[PDB]
Design an enzyme around this catalytic site. Structure first.
Site, PDB file in Angstrom:
ATOM      1  N   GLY A   1       0.783  -1.223   0.000  1.00 21.52           N
ATOM      2  CA  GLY A   1       0.000   0.000   0.000  1.00 21.52           C
ATOM      3  C   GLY A   1       0.817   1.276   0.000  1.00 21.52           C
ATOM      4  CB  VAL A   2      -0.220   4.848  -0.396  1.00 18.79           C
ATOM      5  CG1 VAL A   2      -0.727   4.704  -1.819  1.00 18.79           C
ATOM      6  CG2 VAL A   2      -1.383   4.863   0.586  1.00 18.79           C
ATOM      7  N   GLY A   3       2.482   4.735   1.328  1.00 14.47           N
ATOM      8  CA  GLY A   3       3.123   5.097   2.578  1.00 14.47           C
ATOM      9  C   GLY A   3       4.577   4.682   2.688  1.00 14.47           C
ATOM     10  CG  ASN A   4       7.220   7.504   4.253  1.00 14.90           C
ATOM     11  OD1 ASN A   4       7.945   7.842   3.315  1.00 14.90           O
ATOM     12  ND2 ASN A   4       6.367   8.342   4.839  1.00 14.90           N
ATOM     13  CB  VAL A   5       5.469   1.697   7.151  1.00 16.22           C
ATOM     14  CG1 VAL A   5       5.853   0.448   7.925  1.00 16.22           C
ATOM     15  CG2 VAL A   5       5.488   2.915   8.068  1.00 16.22           C
TER      16      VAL A   5
ATOM     17  CD  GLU B   1      -5.890   0.617  -4.757  1.00 16.13           C
ATOM     18  OE1 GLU B   1      -7.083   0.411  -5.069  1.00 16.13           O
ATOM     19  OE2 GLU B   1      -5.539   0.989  -3.619  1.00 16.13           O
TER      20      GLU B   1
HETATM   21  C1  LIG Z   1      -2.085   5.201   7.226  1.00 20.33           C
HETATM   22  C2  LIG Z   1      -0.995   5.921   6.431  1.00 20.33           C
HETATM   23  C3  LIG Z   1      -1.183   7.437   6.556  1.00 20.33           C
HETATM   24  C4  LIG Z   1       0.363   5.541   6.992  1.00 20.33           C
HETATM   25  O1  LIG Z   1       1.392   6.223   6.285  1.00 20.33           O
HETATM   26  P1  LIG Z   1       2.940   5.868   6.378  1.00 20.33           P
HETATM   27  O2  LIG Z   1       3.716   6.795   5.474  1.00 20.33           O
HETATM   28  O3  LIG Z   1       3.238   4.359   6.191  1.00 20.33           O
HETATM   29  O4  LIG Z   1       3.297   6.152   7.901  1.00 20.33           O
HETATM   30  P2  LIG Z   1       4.030   7.335   8.671  1.00 20.33           P
HETATM   31  O5  LIG Z   1       4.488   6.784   9.988  1.00 20.33           O
HETATM   32  O6  LIG Z   1       5.164   7.890   7.772  1.00 20.33           O
HETATM   33  O7  LIG Z   1       2.950   8.357   8.864  1.00 20.33           O
HETATM   34  C5  LIG Z   1       2.379   9.226   7.870  1.00 20.33           C
HETATM   35  C6  LIG Z   1       1.591  10.333   8.545  1.00 20.33           C
HETATM   36  O8  LIG Z   1       0.583   9.771   9.431  1.00 20.33           O
HETATM   37  C7  LIG Z   1       0.752  10.293  10.727  1.00 20.33           C
HETATM   38  N1  LIG Z   1       0.372   9.256  11.696  1.00 20.33           N
HETATM   39  C8  LIG Z   1       0.666   7.933  11.619  1.00 20.33           C
HETATM   40  N2  LIG Z   1       0.194   7.238  12.668  1.00 20.33           N
HETATM   41  C9  LIG Z   1      -0.435   8.189  13.463  1.00 20.33           C
HETATM   42  C10 LIG Z   1      -1.112   8.126  14.672  1.00 20.33           C
HETATM   43  N3  LIG Z   1      -1.273   6.970  15.329  1.00 20.33           N
HETATM   44  N4  LIG Z   1      -1.619   9.292  15.186  1.00 20.33           N
HETATM   45  C11 LIG Z   1      -1.436  10.419  14.498  1.00 20.33           C
HETATM   46  N5  LIG Z   1      -0.809  10.594  13.346  1.00 20.33           N
HETATM   47  C12 LIG Z   1      -0.321   9.436  12.862  1.00 20.33           C
HETATM   48  C13 LIG Z   1       2.225  10.686  10.833  1.00 20.33           C
HETATM   49  O9  LIG Z   1       2.432  11.655  11.858  1.00 20.33           O
HETATM   50  C14 LIG Z   1       2.417  11.270   9.433  1.00 20.33           C
HETATM   51  O10 LIG Z   1       1.881  12.602   9.371  1.00 20.33           O
HETATM   52  P3  LIG Z   1       2.816  13.891   9.336  1.00 20.33           P
HETATM   53  O11 LIG Z   1       3.885  13.661   8.295  1.00 20.33           O
HETATM   54  O12 LIG Z   1       1.936  15.103   8.978  1.00 20.33           O
HETATM   55  O13 LIG Z   1       3.413  14.089  10.742  1.00 20.33           O
HETATM   56  C15 LIG Z   1      -1.064   5.506   4.937  1.00 20.33           C
HETATM   57  O14 LIG Z   1      -0.553   4.193   4.768  1.00 20.33           O
HETATM   58  C16 LIG Z   1      -2.476   5.612   4.350  1.00 20.33           C
HETATM   59  O15 LIG Z   1      -2.906   6.698   3.961  1.00 20.33           O
HETATM   60  N6  LIG Z   1      -3.173   4.482   4.272  1.00 20.33           N
HETATM   61  C17 LIG Z   1      -4.523   4.435   3.730  1.00 20.33           C
HETATM   62  C18 LIG Z   1      -4.527   4.030   2.232  1.00 20.33           C
HETATM   63  C19 LIG Z   1      -3.989   2.634   2.028  1.00 20.33           C
HETATM   64  O16 LIG Z   1      -3.487   1.996   2.955  1.00 20.33           O
HETATM   65  N7  LIG Z   1      -4.093   2.138   0.798  1.00 20.33           N
HETATM   66  C20 LIG Z   1      -3.621   0.800   0.459  1.00 20.33           C
HETATM   67  C21 LIG Z   1      -3.838   0.457  -0.983  1.00 20.33           C
HETATM   68  S1  LIG Z   1      -2.841   1.446  -2.104  1.00 20.33           S
END
Ligand SMILES: CC(C)(COP(=O)(O)OP(=O)(O)OC[C@H]1O[C@@H](n2cnc3c(N)ncnc32)[C@H](O)[C@@H]1OP(=O)(O)O)[C@@H](O)C(=O)NCCC(=O)NCCS
Ligand SMILES: CC(C)(COP(=O)(O)OP(=O)(O)OC[C@H]1O[C@@H](n2cnc3c(N)ncnc32)[C@H](O)[C@@H]1OP(=O)(O)O)[C@@H](O)C(=O)NCCC(=O)NCCS
Ligand SMILES: [Cl-]
Ligand SMILES: [Cl-]
Ligand SMILES: [Cl-]
Ligand SMILES: [Cl-]
EC number: 2.8.3.18
Lengths: 504, 512
Positions: A268-272, A293
């Site tokens: 999925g989308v995101g850094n992790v 996707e």
């Molecule tokens: C959930 C999601 C935001 C995680 O993103 P990620 O890049 O792996 O994780 P990060 O740890 O780098 O966090 C990204 C942002 O979420 C915020 N965040 C993550 N966990 C959080 C929590 N528990 N509370 C508050 N903010 C949180 C981080 O602070 C960061 O925001 P910022 O840069 O403004 O400070 C992202 O995966 C997402 O949008 N998922 C929904 C869509 C999806 O999963 N699609 C899959 C098919 S393509």
């Protein structure tokens, strides 16, 4: 090298400003664009300027904007600044649009990405007045070649009363041939067709989107880049997560619960999730296959190292430096990538059939393994559910990935109760943080709690979670999924009140 | 007539008690049984007796019980009374078993019914030691004819080390032929097969469960009835709900968003369902088709009248009166009904392809239209999610139906925030209570709230809901899905503490 190879359609070429005048107040506009890839650019800008002008004169001028997924600053960014979008669906990552949404100035609903095409055909968004689609080229036969994503473009072209095409010279001409557009009934009126995909690397369609040329009211020649953020280079937290998952996969293989080459991977989308792919590019699993996707930098790296043979997705989600890399090496990557309609890439019937392994990021999970993907404190939209639900429920294995804490440790990613739920317990089997991996298969809620708390929770928060759980087991109304409703959401309120989930 | 037409297997016939001795402490046991139909009866009763006797002597004796869905008193009831189940899945409606679960004496996880077979094959429940399946007959070549449901029986037969069959002569012989069992790869190892069902009345398999005769360790001759529940006669509330939904179907037809024959219908288990089925029975829609998990009294009637042309399900869900109107005319109804494996009847790919209309009950929904189907106050299990998730997400149209209040008005079925979530906003488009119908298609969460509150909420609770919403809009951390976390679950806590969600006027409340 003329991009508009259909001679007759060249007579419909006009400036962006003129083209935008086709878009009226109240219009439902369907556009291309998926995770910073392939969204129209110049017509949105021209629209946004005219919107601001109209607002000052006291003229209402807003549209309903339906996309593939998230777009870019030229589209979401510009229109939000102009206050010109009254409804938005189904996915956004632009900061300005997000602010509009969380301020209640733009109405937003994040549908399952795989369902958007079908709901559009059903009429859920209203009648589509306009389809605004970016193209690499227009073939002699009048076929529309998509750019760095397919998204909902075919469906939008079918539904829309009028069609506007942006032909972007920036996009690499060798994109032509990378797409697979299927001729069948995926998201139309029931009974729908069987999509004959039985292998992730299997093509069943053609290279072009189809549209009646009589519907094309304007073509705009453009030259402007896709714009998406870079990925965070995996730090010690992300690398720990990757390490736990790869070890997990390894044991699964040894126990013959997974083949040596695993199963088709969705990331999925995101850094992790991207960090995990960087791990896999040098992992012990060969001949991997992607049925995802999006294709992020990490997946592109996997194709590069040879660990992944081929990757199916609906879109690119590359960093500026990765996007520049693939367009210098389109020769190599072109034969290893298939870009499909998003309602095919995220079709549940296909995902389950292929037995995909779903790997997705998350905001937070509660002790029972309910997952929040979207709404911080339960009310503030981040991005959207995307296709994470499409894949999590249909997958062979549903895996969620997150740092155990957020905001420098002031927030726990493991909480007594999720402030919002995107993925129920049944849709989540594996959780991984930098603290460890929780395997929840076959477990009751109380059993899921013990695993999640012990394995995934940060040491700063684990005793507080155990305190909550133990007292819930003593005092809860029911003991099947023990809760203390007086304090279930209290950690979130504490953050709101003090800026940290840690008590004084 | 002889029910066991295979001579060789006849020598494996033995008493229920003897058969029950094959089941040992710690065993994982897979059984037939789905919504009060087709579950084994005599062996579980004998098993329970031996469990109690063991327990009385300080000896441990418990099993893991995996089923199709809910069973009946002879199975869930008996074993729960014996306290002989340490783990249960995926669905239960027995009161005694429910008490064990909610007291933490039986571990429970309610998987999506369509996914249970696949997760068993994956090994999520561990190794299956015993399969215990009720049969109408055993054919000449050793095929096992199921009874009033298919459930997960074929999968359980494949997986289990040892097999026990109960041949139940109470079940009508003419059930043979009503089942459709596929040998294709539905829920096995990827890559799975395409399940080529493109019509609700389409058969893709054969009439019998297949099992290696060498695994059959015992066969028990039985004669005992399925035990479900009396007919839930629709009250005025249920009738009102049915009325609003039929008006909606009528409107969709007139706007060409549904054909005059509607689409294949899935009706959830529950009391509101019969009202809707009764309604369709007398409604203006002809040539109806059923693609559901269960077949209820109402469906039977439409099949009888020709109102409904075919009904596909995994199981019967009948009242005792319905149980034998169909066993008098099984001859007739066997031509109108197809019983499938539950991983076929609840297959997402097939449900979406056919464009099913999903109609399900609910505990509660919050103002933004997230749905709770399972856990009262968030912690106490009712029945289980069942196939409601399978159908709601995959359907062409997802509809949830409920009285606007519960417990004599002391609970609002529309709340600030659901205490537990089974179905997210994206999986629910239509809500119906006796107060009205909310069409949420294309709406943002805030827009969903305005519709649900004005159309579906009880007038006694509407001003409270509006007050929460209004103050959340003013004060919520974010305004996309406005909440006040300080009081989001306070109505549920109020019920726990005082037995009603309605506040006392001896203290301030903002809507006053
Ligand atoms: C959930 C999601 C935001 C995680 O993103 P990620 O890049 O792996 O994780 P990060 O740890 O780098 O966090 C990204 C942002 O979420 C915020 N965040 C993550 N966990 C959080 C929590 N528990 N509370 C508050 N903010 C949180 C981080 O602070 C960061 O925001 P910022 O840069 O403004 O400070 C992202 O995966 C997402 O949008 N998922 C929904 C869509 C999806 O999963 N699609 C899959 C098919 S393509
Ligand atoms: C949710 C469900 C229990 C509703 O059942 P129903 O017959 O439509 O509804 P009723 O109003 O008769 O109520 C059923 C029970 O739930 C209780 N209930 C319903 N809403 C409630 C609420 N908001 N708060 C507390 N209890 C509530 C009722 O009191 C009754 O319980 P009781 O036996 O203790 O008196 C039922 O549909 C279910 O179990 N669904 C999940 C299974 C499913 O949908 N499977 C897919 C289809 S096969
Ligand atoms: Cl398909
Ligand atoms: Cl499981
Ligand atoms: Cl299929
Ligand atoms: Cl919608």
């Amino acid at each position: 090298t003329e991009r508009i190879r259909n001679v007759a359609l060249r007579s419909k070429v006009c400036p962006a400003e003129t083209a935008s005048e086709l878009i009226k107040h109240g219009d439902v506009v369907g556009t291309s664009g998926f995770t910073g890839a392939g969204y129209p650019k110049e017509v949105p800008k021209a629209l946004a300027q005219r919107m601001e002008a109209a607002h000052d004169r006291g003229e209402k001028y807003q549209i309903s904007l339906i996309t593939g997924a998230s777009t870019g600053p030229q589209l979401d960014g510009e229109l939000a600044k102009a206050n010109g979008v009254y409804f938005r669906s189904p996915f956004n990552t632009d900061a300005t649009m997000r602010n509009r949404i969380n301020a209640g100035e733009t109405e937003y609903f994040d549908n399952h990405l795989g369902q958007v095409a079908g709901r559009a055909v059903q009429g859920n968004y209203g009648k589509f007045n306009i389809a605004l689609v970016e193209a690499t080229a227009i073939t002699e036969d009048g076929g529309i070649v998509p750019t760095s994503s397919v998204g909902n473009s075919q469906t939008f072209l079918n539904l829309a009363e009028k069609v506007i095409i942006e032909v972007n010279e920036w996009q690499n001409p060798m994109l032509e041939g990378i797409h697979d557009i299927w001729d069948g009934n995926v998201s139309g009126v029931p009974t729908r067709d069987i999509v004959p995909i039985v292998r992730a690397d299997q093509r069943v369609g053609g290279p072009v989107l189809r549209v009646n040329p009589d519907k094309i009211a304007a073509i705009v020649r453009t030259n402007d880049r896709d714009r998406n953020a870079p990925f965070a280079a995996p730090d010690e937290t992300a690398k720990a997560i990757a390490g736990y998952l790869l070890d997990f996969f390894g044991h699964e293989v040894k126990q013959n619960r997974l083949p040596p080459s695993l199963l088709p991977l969705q990331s999925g989308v995101g850094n992790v999730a991207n960090a995990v792919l960087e791990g896999l590019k040098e992992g012990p699993f060969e001949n991997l296959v992607g049925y995802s996707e999006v294709i992020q930098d990490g997946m592109l790296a996997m194709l590069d190292s040879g660990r992944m043979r081929i990757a199916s997705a609906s879109s690119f989600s590359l960093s500026p430096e990765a996007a520049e890399e693939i367009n210098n090496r389109m020769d190599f990557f072109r034969s290893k990538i298939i870009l499909r309609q998003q309602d095919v890439s995220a079709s549940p019937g296909i995902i389950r059939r292929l037995g995909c392994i779903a790997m997705n990021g998350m905001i937070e999970a509660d002790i029972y393994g309910n997952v929040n993907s979207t709404r911080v404190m339960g009310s503030k939209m981040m991005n959207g559910i995307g296709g994470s639900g499409d894949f999590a429920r249909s997958s062979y294995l549903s895996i969620f990935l997150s740092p155990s804490t957020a905001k420098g440790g002031k927030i726990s990613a493991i909480v007594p109760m999720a402030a919002h739920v995107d993925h129920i317990m049944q849709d989540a089997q594996i959780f991984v943080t930098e603290q460890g991996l929780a395997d929840l298969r076959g477990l009751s809620p109380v059993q899921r709690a013990r695993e999640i708390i012990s394995k995934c929770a940060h040491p700063d928060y684990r005793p507080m979670l155990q305190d909550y759980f133990d007292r819930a087991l003593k005092n809860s109304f029911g003991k099947h999924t023990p809760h203390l409703l007086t304090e279930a959401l209290s950690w979130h309120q504490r953050f709101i009140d003090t800026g940290t989930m840690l008590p004084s």
